[model samples]
Target chain A: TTPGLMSPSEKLKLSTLTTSIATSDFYASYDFMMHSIGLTSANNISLLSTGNISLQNILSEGNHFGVQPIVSSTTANASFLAGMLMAIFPKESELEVTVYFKTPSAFNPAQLTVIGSTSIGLGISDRSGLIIENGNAFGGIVKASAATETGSTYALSTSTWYICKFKMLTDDRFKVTLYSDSGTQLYSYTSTAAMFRADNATAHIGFKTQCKTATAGISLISIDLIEFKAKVSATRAKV
Target chain B: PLATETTPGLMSPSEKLKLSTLTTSIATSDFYASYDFMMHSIGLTSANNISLLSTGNISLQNILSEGNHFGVQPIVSSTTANASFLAGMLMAIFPKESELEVTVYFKTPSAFNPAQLTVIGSTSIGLGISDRSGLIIENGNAFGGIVKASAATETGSTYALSTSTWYICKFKMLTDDRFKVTLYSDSGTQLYSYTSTAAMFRADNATAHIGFKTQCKTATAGISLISIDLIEFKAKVSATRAKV
Candidate 1:
């Protein structure tokens, strides 16, 4: 396992691309200054590998892993991400998560996602995650039968800390709440978001960005502290 | 202690199986008992990994994926308000009359005034219980010492546990639906075995779950902390139970 087969100012530079991961106290809590076990500079950029299946795509803005598709073509549009298949979603269950991150660069030009999951037996359509489609932030669940989005119309700005909380509420409603880094409420939305099956084993919770600009350049999205997944006493414990 | 078959030169199948505890295969053989047993490691998936849970504990969760070891202290709540619990999230349930056996490796740390822990067959996802096996306690006055529960009785055994001391306990429901509690030493030696005659009210529901539940005098009776190095669950079921 020799990585130079042999191989720090660059080490100092790492103190500066941040990684967003963790969960909290109903059944969870994780906080990191990029200090999770087995996470290292050599293994830093794990390209999104999934049910089948990044470099200069990772730049930094202080404590940020700004993901922008690094390409030379005049026309390009593709999605790239670094995700973790972090937890499970059992039947009649629920979970809660809060993440500190940045909104996508602008409307119709860039899109960034903070969380998501592909369920057991039903894969992608049986999904849920928050997306920052520029100023309008929303996400959806169950698409193979009928697609839906938990809509939020509040416009957001860039280069600032926006705290977002996700709740799989007891009423089968998916709630997304936004706050200031100092804990001030900005906006909130909830909708009926249920699943096709009972449990989602090894479901995903991740970060990704889509970018395109024929006449312009791409803007990067950031993620830092995410108080991620856990179990609950009641049935509000979905993805 | 020695078991003798003085008149015979060959060993009995039961005696050979008895010594087979040196390897898991012997204890795992269904020939040693009734109802077959299939043991699966429970939830520690990212969905079950609470960011609120500890780092080492999470590592324990990650390690257990290889059928290895991990330690977890499920967060504490109350017997009254908190109704605190931890999900095994097995996703499959054994039917009524099936034998449900759960073995937990643990020891209490320090003490809580009136707190105790138990293993149960839940009627809900993580907490609401339909059938419970027994209690492991600290200095909790009304709930002190080691005890077992069945549909007919709830009482103590000759076994008294000390705080910070470890034991491997198998809390089980017999195939006839009675409760059984067996305590073993750290090195896999049996210390005690008691099977109650009571017929437990095992829920016939299709959605029954399995998990750990803790009881405190109340949320304010201080907190109880314990580390569970491992939990192994097994079951032998009726024809309608989960086979895979």
Candidate 2:
């Protein structure tokens, strides 16, 4: 057709993974080419107007991730997540997620993750995901079937930029590493045993606050993720 | 960062599905001068994420100082029809393959005869069938403010062209690829309407763009010039809904 308009297969050399489209309820490649390019994710459709998350323009529109739409929780104890349609499969056992992010004045309780099934579950098990958290502590969350693993609260600065690298080993383990925008390591966490999702197709990549605070949540400049078939496949073990 | 319209949409009772419709607005503040609007010039990126066509320099310029809109007049008018064209930018019709509605504001200040103020998809591939819509001023003053509709050739409108006059050219590409073009007086009178169909909303241009394709019998005959004010694009995020 128009070649690379919205066909990810045509645009991303992913015709082999083309079947992934049917799995998403709300989809977006969101390279911010002047408006999001895929289906509007049901989760984020109301997030912006509801004020739970606001579309912001901190960088150039092309790189703004399309407003990157900042998640600002002004209300008390707000619990909401915003993201687009994207799925990381179990078949691709290893996953690497990288995010270009900026922090607010504080991080009381916020998480940026790739989740499965739902973001509104009352407990960790119901909210299946692999995440980098700033709740109570700065770390990662691997909600495993054996047991949930929450990492240490290594402190990070406010009003600064950082790179979050989250690596997942599917339904079992995870590793979260924080780095300076210039690529200097600052914080690192590895789960004793973690689960990225329920090992299913309902998974998605997103950001949220379990309970927002006056100084909670962070703005995302952009997010990049990749899936691999094995732990050793393109693995980067740098500390 | 140029402000996006995040309007909430309706939902089905059973699924809790909320359809998110997005609107992107591009106006005076949107035009950045880094990308020179010169003959066959490219490399302009606007605040609204509007991109310049890399090929076929159409000699575009911003006349916000002279007036309020982006001004475009070819360096030379072509007696040959549809010979010279210029668009403010390649306006992205996003949420690909979904339904879309676009409205542009502007007017022709000079002679209308042979002057075509078109908003058709400027570039397309595979079959190379661009110019999917036309808003023509016809060939002469004989039409008396009448405009033609339908075609990559683009149809016309009723309002006469005047530097002081402004009109909104609206085009809609719906679900079944049913396309419609309508012209209106800036104040809101439906001057013209044409119904048609497209292979896909993007069938015309893989990525959609709208602009002016002007023509005059001779360069000295009269200018086929137009000035643009603003553009509003509304699109359903996708043909399919999401679980979010």
Candidate 3:
């Protein structure tokens, strides 16, 4: 649903709506490949994680998930990556969002929280500000005018394969794009949540290592998070 | 002389004749593995990074994963009318009433008096080939295995002879979906005869359906596969019947 950026059927008309086929429980999907047991020196990069939830590993299946800015790695400057991932918030989902890699270990100054029970916030903790921010998984606190742009490019060469595309469109706007070595689109970030926010809200997704200095080696090859919502037309659900 | 197989008036006829002259076949290939029955069928508790597959006296629990499963024949037939065709990609892990016992290890051409191994023609069918004087059995659904060398395995059909010697071929399967193919030499003797069938080749309960072809039919060329070792595979774990 991503081509030339945004057109979700022309601004959410969702393509001349006339939909009616719902008993939905679709889960026939089959493609299970998991590799990455490394906690240190597992030969960095080849990161594949997915058990299923929209069950994606992303090479292409339309534009996959929720647009944001999570993908950090510049020659394991305390972080590393490969590409392809999924967990999709489900521990019984009451809300959970954790985006790691903001080191210097807490004691007073180490903020990057998106905790949830009812929601607890605070986003930009800055270990050295890498860029790509817009947090409020629920209780909002850190939004230094809501930062964004760590188009990541520091060590960039070792096996090479990076891609990031997150899109969650509808008035609350959210989009962040990054891709290299395939279907090019280096970076894009957008954020807007001035009001109304509740589309089942699910976010468990993982992998965000933190080590500061004495122990640094982070890697993620494939990581994914997706959620696309905005469908209520039967003449707008008969008003 | 207490090396297992207990009770029978415990030893002493010269220590049971030196344990029956030290039961050869390398003590039946050094067999022993009952680690409390593999920790009660892997009810795991402790055994860091495990990976166990040990077979001896062959049987290896009927080599489950189905009857004689082996690989690597990705087409190899050289010249002089050489033909290459393989399908269904050999696999027989039992239960369609269960059947499959194929042993193919190759390196052929002593000049070929008769060399033909074909089992092509399947849409759910049976085949057989039973010892025809050392080996030559071809029945239905087009059975297979025929090794004969009284002479003629070419070296000067105009030149082209490669060698790395090794050959063993024996097949036997039963349970009304009968099959009996034989051709051997990994010192299991018998080099021919016994190719029979009852049109029951298509295995899957775990997976097994194979198709192979090797020709030298009176010396033309073909048969160099050096590995396919499924010494034995047995099955009898079914309690239900058919329905398509």
Candidate 4:
């Protein structure tokens, strides 16, 4: 209702991730700003209290994959996972996943990602400190090493709040959008696979980070609800 | 068994169990009362661990003089009196224009005996209705008094000693250059009085006990105090207490 619409054969991916006014049983540091953006993750709540959380994973050969909490690292991880989410969008037909987020700034773009589901490990870094990693991979993850947009168009301030909406468009178009008090056009992936369908609808959504002293913590405010959509499709561009 | 009321407490033999609470005029009673006031049940009860762990500051006058000059032996024996002692220190409630008020609590088995209570400062001691005399003894033995004035020597003729059960002595500076000393009891019973227009209680000249120069010749003397609260004028004294 705020602005913009989808064209013919296009689908709408509202912030279905929007939360009902439900309280949580766990302990977390949720601030007032979090509610307006619709985050409902206990981890996000704890991170808010500490101001930062460092993320790392022990991959192979006892080596660890580093992830920083800075804007760059987050975007890099988000972009990489977004690619995977896009990979499955063309075939799934009707699919939607919502991530709790906020636009920090028009310039400071936040990235999203999906990793392997079986990844279990922990990492210690300067930015966020000690982090315990659990669970599986995310959907359509993308990672951003640096900013692609110019002109300092940062949206959210550091440690603010927002939400992101992801939807699969008809004919293999994946759209991702971020909304705060105001909405912004986050990047979307136009699939070239014609009909590359996703193997599974259930995946992980994550915020990544590496070894950085300054921007080290990852705060997930809350994820009230995670709407995982699964739909049947014919897997064809045209009738 | 001519027991006088003046003897200290002591213990009774096992055969006298029925008369344990009974009072008898015998030297044995003195011993029994002394025991009761110190080591036995009564003495144990009164023999507390009182301490003045701290004084805000040590720079005030006459504090160290009186505290140190007063011996570590602040306990009284009624035959019952033991090594056990109860100690408590008093402080100045308010500062005066030129002097201060000192309140002392002497609730021990030993009452006012000139030697038992000593003045560390001044040179002379005077006794009168007002001014500097040590604590005025009213009843059998009372331990409450005021710091009327500072002294240099003892004008032995001024202050009189009594064997009252309780007494309060008020000491303050006078306008004419002397100090006023008043001694009474908790009931406002004025037992002794002394004032010093010229000098106050001072120890530089002579050292003597502060209670009766000697035991009462006419009546038997028996006095004990549990706690003595003393408030010195504008002076701070540290009373440290230890587990030992």
Candidate 5:
């Protein structure tokens, strides 16, 4: 078994994840990677291919998560949602999630939000763009500034594979790093301001569509590996 | 409904033999270079999805060309009986009006199992052949080769294939529902050829999948890998041929 980001010493409180040989049915099961991982819920938001939700050999023979709408539908606001509702990490604690994925040219740009509170959330806008929030207070301020907005070119192209690292630091800050398939860093982003405490402790962590557009229908997205971890302070060590 | 091969102006009695000769020689390295021209010349379409399954590992990596060729490597896990390998791509682009012609280049390694009730070769279009049909290297021994064809089946002569050698396998579906399996050495030598009439083996649908598969078991360790260099599929170009 490959060693995950959080070591045994880290006292990983919960892990809600999947792996190769672990089918989509594994997600439907309540075992939760044998419950060592922690996530409150996982719900499917779109009517993608039944086989797409399962293991496939399209990109790599290695098993990966494939999400694509089986049939094009006219339903407006139709979204492909693979979401989880939970507060896996503590407030102001450093947490991270690394997703190794490939976006085919057929895939439409969609929002991937992770680890949120009413105040702030971190994720990517379309696998090519980046997003991070600061000073986001519920009912007071609901603004998500673009870290790598359009017109600012990065090394991201369609039909290419990449590894994205989304990290949250203890100082109430967030960092996003993108890498090539071979683990070469392509781009990185550190939030400009400290993260705001969430008005709602529990937040939605997953991929969702923000609004309807011409590119609203689901497209092929291959996810090979995903690891979620957190940093533990040495002072909190147990005998 | 299109002009059949019997069009007197297009082909005489002598022309049929020449056409056969032209197709028989299609399994050569030199002919492989003209695949793109011939496939388009004849009329064929390609699909984007490639499905692979195995007990060990199977993948389409080190893409030699964007969609024309890919490096396929199949490995074995433990010494237990499992569907050793299944690696192929789907091309749901064929017309019932025309026979489908397929050619694939495989660099068979010298080190392969022999006499283990194993299959070590290629498979035709999915929508064309039945589930149990394939070119089998009987028991891992090329000498006792077998062709689990559409309706009729046959075995080839011994020494048809060599270890650690590159060979081209050509599969043709005749208009009369006849399937032809021919193996040719990279140097353009006819290693094996067998023709049989199987009416059930017809790819009359839009999606015609083509690839290879293998199955075997052994008391000891076993390693079998068929390196696929390239694959080309073509159909007759005619107005009567259905199109999607």
Candidate 6:
């Protein structure tokens, strides 16, 4: 049986295809993260690996795998991320991705850079830690690109897991929140209205870290889990 | 003259050689066993996964995937030799038959001691190999211990398996009130076999649950990993069987 293209029935069928079904719901707990990489697999997450980034399986500790990255002079500018083309839908009302990470060693005053931006593209900043720009200055200076919000500097502990969440709200605003493994809210920031440019249907989501100095010392960060959703809500389990 | 002719010489050997294969598809009473097994298999695609099951003692720990197979390891902290059950998802069924087969890949930690440890078990029946260096099967009243003489009236050899080596165990019911169990190397070499006559007991509740369970007589901090492949059960066609 054959049906003509764009027939009355076909058009009715096409109208039912809304953005609700186009949004993505991705959840991987490090164990399977290795499978979600590169452009080879049908569903590869596509990572931008440039330096000492490895998928390590720590069986003895807890039988979990984590994406380990070492920050150094040559690799300071390195970054690895996934979801560049399918991060958000054109008609999506909201989007979010939560990352679970841990530090293997002592935390140096290493300016742990962790921020996201949508103006240039959906990406985490290659430099600076926890900068949420919106259009103004909170303490003193005005950031160049967009008004930004920054988190208080702290010496994060070693061997402890942390949760950081980034959310794109319906009002075209962005928010970032950090929590301890015990669900203690460490930091929160809300962007200025319309600071985020929703001009595209896709986005890039990732993490970037660097040492304050080239010789500050070698640091290792492991990402244990990542959860992303668009126009859908996910409940996190309390560990 | 005829459109079609049927003659012994007319049809050559090749024409008469229509080949067919015989396939015996034996159905089991445990219909949900495969689904539950595969569910647990796919559920732990990642490491450090735990499932808190609602059924009794059906929680899973250290479940992960290895080489396209699901691996389950005992959680040392939660594992007790003689306490409440800590097992995988349970499929409740009642198979009133004497014929069944269970095939699984099993491995023990490097520090495993052959002392008495039950690797796969239910409330009444259990199948495992102990430090006594021999395969054992225990049913509340009767047990086929490592000692061949201690087992029921059956003629089979007792053999030991190496630790950390993956082995296959095939347990079958020879007939009503009689059963046979075999163990093979991962490469399919028969490691051991034992057959015995004993009274068969149904699972704990009216409906039986089948899956993996482990316990040790001594509080050994060692773990045993098990990967199940298939579980087949056969019953008499006329026997009254419970629905899954």
**Best by lDDT, which number?**
1
Candidate 6, A1-239: lDDT as tens digits: 22122335333322322222232353322222222222111122334444433333322123222234444444443333433333333225365656666665655543344434321212323212233122111111123433354434444566766667767667645677767776687766665543333344333343434343435235546554454445443345546
Encode model 5's per-residue lDDT on A88-135: one tens digit a residue. 344343555555555545434332222222211122222221331111
C-alpha RMSD values across all candidates: 20.3, 19.9, 24.7, 32.1, 21.0, 19.6
Q: Where does model 5 exceed 4 Å of error?
A: A1-239, B1-49, B56-74, B95-98, B115-131, B140-153, B156-159, B200-209, B218-221, B236-244
Provide the lowest-lDDT 10-residue window in model 4 chain A: A58-67
- What are the chain A TM-scores of the candidates, in order? 0.55, 0.53, 0.21, 0.33, 0.50, 0.57
Candidate 5 lDDT by residue in tens digits, B123-189: 4422222333334454334432323444335454545455656777776656664556677877778
Point out the higher-scoring one by lDDT: 2 or 5. Answer: 2
Sliding window of 10 residues with minimal summed lDDT for model 1 chain A: A18-27
**Candidate 2 chain A: 10-residue stretch with minimal lDDT:** A223-232
Q: What is the CA-based DockQ of model 3?
A: 0.00
Candidate 1 per-residue lDDT over residues A100-160, each given as its tens digit: 6655444454443444443321133344656565566665554563556556466777657
Cα displacement (angstroms), candidate 1, residue B229, comes to 9.3
lDDT of 3 by residue, B56-106 (tens): 111111101101221112123344332322222223334335453434443
Of the true interface contacts, each candidate retains a share of 0.00, 0.04, 0.00, 0.00, 0.00, 0.00
Error of 3 at A7 (Å): 30
- Tally clashes: model 3: 48
TM-scores of all predicted structures: 0.37, 0.38, 0.22, 0.22, 0.36, 0.38
Prediction 4 TM-score vs. true: 0.22
Per-prediction DockQ, in order? Answer: 0.01, 0.04, 0.00, 0.01, 0.01, 0.01
Error of 5 at B104 (Å): 2.1
| Per-residue lDDT of candidate 4, residues A138-209 (tens digit) | 123221222121121222354433344555556544444444423354333333322223334222222222
lDDT of 6 by residue, B125-177 (tens): 22221121113422111123322223333224445445545566655534463
